[PDB]
């Protein structure tokens, strides 16, 4: 499995226990705070990260990534990208595309709230798998991600 498969799964198995109702609630309360910035959704998230080594932008981005499935309750859609799911939006909003542009281009210092406003921006739900291996690639020096979010926008 890739990271982000293994990170669905561990959600998922959360969304199915009794726990879910309380770690929902600090997931989505933690929109409000930087990932990983958010102390009562760590006992929700370290116990997985602990099962591997990562730096402090990757477990950020796994923070992020179980906030926003959160924002969508956990509805995940398979091959339904945020890309795609942007495309779908723009149709009925031609400034969507701009959002979608400021997106591929958003640093460091943007890409949390950027992100959080695209998933809030669109209708149903995405595939938060890849969503989690894309934000864990996002700051490579090639930007493949981006040029791979733009082929699936254009694309559809």
């Known amino acids: 499995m890739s990271p982000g498969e293994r ?10 226990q009794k726990a879910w109702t309380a770690a929902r609630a600090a997931f989505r309360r933690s929109l409000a705070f ?3 910035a958010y ?4 006992p929700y998230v ?3 990260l602990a099962k591997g080594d990562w730096r402090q932008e990757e477990r950020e981005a796994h ?3 179980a906030a926003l499935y959160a924002l969508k309750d956990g509805d995940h859609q398979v091959g339904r990208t945020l890309a795609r799911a942007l495309w779908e939006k723009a ?3 031609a400034s969507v595309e701009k959002r979608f542009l ?6 460091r210092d943007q890409i ?15 595939d938060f798998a890849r969503l989690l291996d894309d934000l864990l690639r996002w700051f490579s020096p090639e930007r493949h991600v981006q040029a791979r979010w733009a082929r699936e926008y254009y694309g559809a």
Do not use: C, H, N, T
């Open 39 to 42: 102390p009562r959704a760590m």
């Open 46 to 48: 370290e116990p997985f």
């Open 7 to 16: 990170f669905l799964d561990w959600l998922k198995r959360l969304q199915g």
């Open 63 to 65: 923070y992020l990534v």
């Open 34 to 36: 930087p990932p990983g």
């Open 112 to 126: 949390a709230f950027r992100l959080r406003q695209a998933v809030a921006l669109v209708e149903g739900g995405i």
């Open 102 to 107: 400021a997106l591929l281009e958003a640093d």
């Open 91 to 93: 149709q009925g909003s």
